[PDB]
């Protein structure tokens, strides 16, 4: 019966996983931007 809380929580770890990669993309382009105006 506890094999249930394993899904709702896994999807949260994947939800937080998503937003991480989004922040990463934004940072990378910010780096590329700074390097251009160098």
């Amino acid at each position: 019966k506890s094999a249930d809380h394993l899904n709702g929580l896994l999807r949260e770890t994947e939800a937080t996983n998503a937003i991480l990669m989004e922040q990463i993309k934004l940072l990378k382009s910010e780096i590329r931007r700074l390097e251009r105006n160098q």
């Binding site: 939800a15 937080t16 937003i19 989004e22 922040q23 934004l26 940072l27 910010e30």
Partner: protein
């Protein structure tokens, strides 16, 4: 159990989190970039609680991420600087942004930081207490430098879950 810190630049968001997580303070200012993440299972109030903390940027470039996290967080702490009139006015912005993502399905706390600078105060306590009731959210003044009301803040938030 997730919290998100919103507010203008250099109001003390990063500082209030430090005073709480590590009980330290740094005078040297560093603008928060993106969204720093901190977590600590502070056994708060005769019982145990796990807290996720999202430190957002007051910086204008790094705001596109914010809305996505507001949607993910069950609590919002809106911080202003009592020696800065603008940062106080802008708290309306940040609450609107939150109402948009969660409506009334969220716990919100307005915070008037930097009380140790009472000499240079521009915003009164009445204006703050008034605005809080106005927008139906909790209110509290603090000082991250002095450690004043910083524990009190998180204690009151855990009591409304």
């Amino acid at each position: 159990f997730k919290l998100v810190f919103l507010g203008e630049q250099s109001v003390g968001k990063t500082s209030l989190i430090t005073r709480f997580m590590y009980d330290s303070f740094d005078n040297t200012y560093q603008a928060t970039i993106g969204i720093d993440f901190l977590s600590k299972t502070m056994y708060l109030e005769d019982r145990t609680v796990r807290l996720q903390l999202w430190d957002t940027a007051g910086l204008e470039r790094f705001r596109s991420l914010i809305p996505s996290y507001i949607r993910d967080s069950t609590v919002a702490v809106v911080v202003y600087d009592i020696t800065n009139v603008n940062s106080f006015q802008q708290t309306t912005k940040w609450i609107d942004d939150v109402r948009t993502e969660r409506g009334s399905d969220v716990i919100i706390m307005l915070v008037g930081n930097k009380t140790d600078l009472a000499d240079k105060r521009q915003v009164s306590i009445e204006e703050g207490e008034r605005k809080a009731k106005e927008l139906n959210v909790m209110f509290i003044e603090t000082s991250a430098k002095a450690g004043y009301n910083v524990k009190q803040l998180f204690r009151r938030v855990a009591a409304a879950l």
